[PDB]
Amino acid sequence: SGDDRELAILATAENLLEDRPLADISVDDLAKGAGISRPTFYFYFPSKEAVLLTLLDRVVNQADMALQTLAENPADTDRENMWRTGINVFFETFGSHKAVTRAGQAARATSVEVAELWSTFMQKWIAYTAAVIDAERDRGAAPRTLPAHELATALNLMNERTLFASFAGEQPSVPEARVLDTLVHIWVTSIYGENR
């Protein structure tokens, strides 16, 4: 069937990207994994690059839907926990799909569609962050220091670079078992910290 063969292709690709990068994975490898022929592959996708775009789109929307769920239901907690739970959506969602994350970031250089997808969602997440900061200031809990959108931008770019370094075991990187605490500290201190 249609959905079924498409889903097999996507599953095969996610599995193979755990062992090697996209440039070392052939359309034949994808077709063989999904139990189809090569020209049947080309009915569902034009290129192996398109398969990666679809996988990345799935993961990014997963994160975005999780964040939306959280935005609807507040945990009954203190401000530090509020931010930890939110950053954790990204830590768990992308950390549960490390191969797709790593491949997707590398594709930003060579694929205008992948760059645009990542840009679009980063803008959305920055805007949301800035809206929460603005709410915290309006209720008197956070000081009016930097422009909230500029602060949100830098904190979100920190998380993009730091999470993906950690997941890839780059040198340098924060260890994966430390990265959530590290990021939460920097978000909380910079959002709530006053000018001396």
Place this chain on the structure above:
Amino acid sequence: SGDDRELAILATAENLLEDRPLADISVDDLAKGAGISRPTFYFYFPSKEAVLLTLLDRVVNQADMALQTLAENPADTDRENMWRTGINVFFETFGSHKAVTRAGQAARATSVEVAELWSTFMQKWIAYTAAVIDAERDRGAAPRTLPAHELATALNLMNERTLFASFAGEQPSVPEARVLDTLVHIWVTSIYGENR
């Protein structure tokens, strides 16, 4: 002469990278700019990729030497200024060589030598940051909150990603005229901010 023709090659390359990426720049373009023949080019460098490595090495060492100069002579100032002056070395050095910065970051994906160069200097800068944090804690000015090396790592990765986004005018990015204040705020609040 030897140094002279090498320097012309490097100058030509830095000029051409302002207009286009390395993949659209030929060895003939480099040789023509430097007033030499193609095989004379190959006496001084093996590839256009090697030229970029040399340019990047120059810029990274420029920044590192500037930071060393600062580490020798303290400004007579408050703590926020101490960090601003130091972050400004990177803002001015890389911001004065935007084409080389942009090309060098893109080459990290395809060049093990470029990745290793950037890794080596990031480790050095992180270690230095962490040593200053540790000094600030030992004198009683900064609280003992996160592991200083993990904090330094995330702050330095923030700056890498945020500065290069700003210089490239990426969407999203902090405007270049705002990025120094934004980064300094987040470093100062996270280094000096207490646990509530």
